[PDB]
Amino acid sequence: GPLGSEEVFLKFVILHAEDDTDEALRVQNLLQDDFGIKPGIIFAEMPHGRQHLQNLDDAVNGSAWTILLLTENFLRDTWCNFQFYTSLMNSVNRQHKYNSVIPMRPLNNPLPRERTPFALQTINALEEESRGFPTQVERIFQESVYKTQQTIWKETRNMVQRQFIA
Secondary structure (H helix, E strand, O other): OOOOOOOOOOEEEEOOOOOOOOHHHHHHHHHHHHHHHOEEEEEEOOOOOOOOOOOOOHOOOOOOOOOEEEOOOHHHHHHHHHHHHHHHHHOOOOOOOOOOOOEEEEOOOOOOOOOOOOOOOOOOOOOOOOHHHHHHHHHOOOOOOOOHHHHHHHHHHHHHHOOOOO
16 A cells, blocks of 8 residues: 555544445434544545545555445445455455444445345444444444554554555
8 A cells, every 4th residue: 555644543434336425424424423433434525635536445444444335336336346356355354453344234225135245244234224223333333342443553553564564
């Protein structure tokens, strides 16, 4: 990756598509309030300069979890990438590392399991149309967890700056 670009202790990113970018946002919005999951920003809000935004890795970088807006397109989009890059496919293993992978389920966007990967389907996915929507939102994004993810990150800055730089 980079050398030492803008670094922030962001809470977590929300990977969404331009199709359901308002949906993923609609959540991140209630996220930083209902429970107080801040800071909260969407991939459509993520600023940049010389660097590109088409970095699915960025979302899987310096964070706690990543929202994977499973969509007919959003699927073939990244899903396609995966095939080209198993890098992301690794985050599908639900790495306990600082960053996590939490594939959220859209409500306005109908996406059955038949469209969901057996990997993201066998992982704790986020849901807003469920009764435990607030629960998972609490567990997944819980302070007790915000620490570990904060200690794993602050630590990831070592091994990297050591002999594992991006």
